[PDB]
Design a protein around this ligand. Structure first.
Ligand SMILES: Nc1ncnc2c1ncn2[C@@H]1O[C@H](C[S@+](CC[C@@H](N)C(=O)O)Cc2ccccc2[N+](=O)[O-])[C@@H](O)[C@H]1O
Ligand SMILES: [Mg+2]
Ligand SMILES: [Mg+2]
Ligand SMILES: [Mg+2]
Lengths: 408, 406
């Protein structure tokens, strides 16, 4: 019998697929910006587990600040040279020392060492051809703050946090054909299965999707690992092999559309200027990266959908409402899109300062209905879903800490 | 035959929608400091390359990390405790090979970059001591050969796109958008700060519209050397509040405008938004590039946005910058057309293609009532073509500092 500020409105516009144009981009796992996002969030999760193990609660921190400076390299067919390591700077802030006045004690937490280790372990996980011992420098200037033990005691209650702000989050569902194709192309090209078959395929993968009516053009940037290509001929063969597999994929999930595929379009075979790398990422020299300049929490960049500019990765999963709302809005929209009669769904969430985060100032649900469905038949089910997720706001926090949801 | 596409868009105009959220991070905000420094470095390197070779060489310094410092604010004047650390980064042509001498010649990228960053900081932070309050480090590195090759391939003709990217633009600005934009610009204008030197440059403005009610929330750093006490601080807030009220009446006529300033203040305990330098960077707050305003100067989740960070990217062939400026220019001109209520422009590149040959130049138009898109389409198409014909004027506008990147 709990009452919230939930709004359901019928959205009387053309669905996304019926609109004539779509542009969708995804920065893959080995992309420098995605590397930074992933490190930012991995450090946060590591600190969360650090806090949980000591206190059984999560303390204030934000590590949504990571800078990747491109290294120096000399690619060469058969195996190139890494000259200067990739330099990564961890930044942000985290609670480090707890001042207890009652007890005459100070507890200090391994903030910096935890951070550096988390970053290193994430890099080891995603970058097959980077030797993290020699190819990377992980520096750390994360601020180390203090906190009164009494405030720790309060946090240990693990009550729903209050919104300390008027913040916004937006999400939508379902993914369009173009969105789905862009997303799964990158996922496939960075899957273990493909790597094993075509080890020359690096992790620095970018996928741009343009839809014109019922024609989808995929433009793929793909770093080739030079130890696996003996010459320009073998380089070409890798491109064609990848093209074939992407064609097959397009048939599987974009059947009915005309699909056109372009790979490494900056290449000039004549001048022998191609996307050749030593490590499989342009972070080795070609490009730099930092946090919040890539994918939204749904894993896409979508100028035909509403987007939040806030950088989710690295933000406090406890009390940063913007991060929580953008993830929550996505989770809610996804379930509402599963409902019978829902063609398209947009969810916007706005916080009420001074109020619990799961008691928003407004939660707006916009639904494009399928033909012959009444929005008023759907609305009850929709509000129930939204209220269910809001009741379980603390479960959303857990999902983030356990990495069961994406932040990029 | 350019790939220009024009569509009628049948949705509710933004002004008529019930809710609107708009944000602007002012010049002194840590993220905007980074954007500003990034662009200053690029402009400086452009000038240096031009002086030495009569041409611009490959670079992209769209990477600046600001690690917050620490300070001790105090009425009448406080002091810095730990310097703000800023890391200049990105790609740049660091050296050239003298093929005849068979020797490497180093270019002054590092010195040019560090000087440019310091000069910019001096400009936007009146009360910062760059010798004591800030550390500017530099790790800009050589770009890859493939990057340089694409840059040089047709630099003398029509440059080839540095990347596969899209830019976005739209027009006109809504009442809320213009209010947020002009509030910050006004409060960070030299004329106002000369009148009220207590006003720091770190000004964050957020506009929330609900119907015809606009709530303006302002977070404004106050410079503690210009406020003797909590009372003088209070007088600053109310002076600024009066100014913004007057401004709102001029450009938001017919709307109910609420103005909330530094809402986290606690006068009872004298815990207020006091700073030594006029920026929250001194408070341990961090910044980086492309975390804030788009090229139109706003953050707009109810408008289409590009995630590209224009600041610091080279103005020759990086479409991540050029197409975002170009899209804004085209949208503005189309918005001038009678029968056009709203216009959205999206411009997509393909890496290696001439920058005047976008893979798609996408135009959406909300028409005024009783106007035919068929009458508007040819005009919109001509504006787009006109601009692609003059695409080199974009570079020229950027280099001459005639447009903003944030
Ligand atoms: N040779 C390449 N061809 C295609 N894509 C690339 C190449 N190198 C890197 N990328 C991918 O593009 C991303 C941004 S890169 C950003 C450019 C900028 N950092 C620069 O300094 O040149 C693009 C790029 C870099 C070097 C050569 C060619 C390109 N390019 O035309 O695309 C980068 O993060 C990679 O994922
Ligand atoms: Mg980038
Ligand atoms: Mg920020
Ligand atoms: Mg980009």
């Amino acid at each position: 019998s709990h009452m919230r500020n939930i709004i359901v409105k019928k959205l009387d516009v053309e669905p996304i697929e019926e609109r004539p144009t779509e542009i969708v981009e995804r920065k893959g796992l080995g992309h420098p910006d995605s590397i930074c996002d992933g490190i930012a969030e991995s450090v946060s999760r590591a600190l969360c587990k650090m806090y949980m193990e000591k206190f059984g609660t999560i303390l204030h921190h934000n590590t949504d600040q990571v800078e990747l400076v491109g290294g120096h390299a000399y690619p060469k067919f058969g195996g190139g040279v890494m000259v200067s390591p990739i330099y990564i700077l961890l930044s942000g802030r985290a609670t480090m020392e707890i001042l207890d006045k009652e007890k005459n004690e100070v507890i200090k937490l391994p903030v910096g060492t935890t951070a550096v280790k988390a970053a290193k372990e994430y890099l080891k996980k995603v970058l097959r051809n980077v030797d993290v011992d020699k190819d990377v420098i992980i520096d750390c200037r994360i601020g180390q703050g203090s906190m009164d033990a009494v405030d720790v005691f309060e946090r240990q209650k693990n009550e729903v946090p209050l919104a300390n702000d008027t913040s916004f989050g937006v999400g939508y569902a379902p993914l369009s054909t173009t969105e789905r194709l862009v997303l799964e192309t990158e996922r496939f090209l960075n899957s273990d299965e493909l790597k094993n078959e075509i080890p020359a395929v690096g992790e620095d993968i970018k996928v741009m999707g343009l839809r014109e009516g019922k024609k989808i053009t995929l433009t793929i940037a793909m770093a080739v690992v030079d130890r696996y290509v003996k010459n320009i001929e073998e380089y070409k063969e890798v491109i064609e092999k990848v093209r074939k597999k992407v064609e097959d994929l397009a048939k599987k999930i974009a059947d009915g559309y005309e699909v056109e595929i372009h790979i490494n379009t900056a290449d000039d075979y004549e001048r022998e200027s191609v996307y050749l790398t030593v490590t499989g990422t342009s972070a080795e020299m070609g490009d730099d990266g930092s946090v919040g300049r890539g994918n939204r929490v749904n894993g896409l960049i979508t100028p035909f959908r509403p987007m939040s500019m806030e950088a989710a990765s690295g933000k406090n999963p406890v009390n940063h409402v913007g991060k929580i709302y953008n993830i929550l809005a996505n989770l809610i929209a996804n379930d509402i899109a599963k409902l019978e009669g829902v063609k398209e769904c947009y969810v916007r969430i706005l916080s009420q300062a001074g109020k619990p985060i799961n008691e928003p100032k407004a939660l707006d649900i916009e639904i494009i209905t399928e033909d012959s469905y009444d929005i008023k038949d759907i609305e009850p089910k929709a509000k129930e879903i939204a209220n269910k997720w809001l009741d379980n706001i603390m479960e959303v926090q857990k999902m983030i800490v356990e990495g069961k949801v994406t932040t990029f």
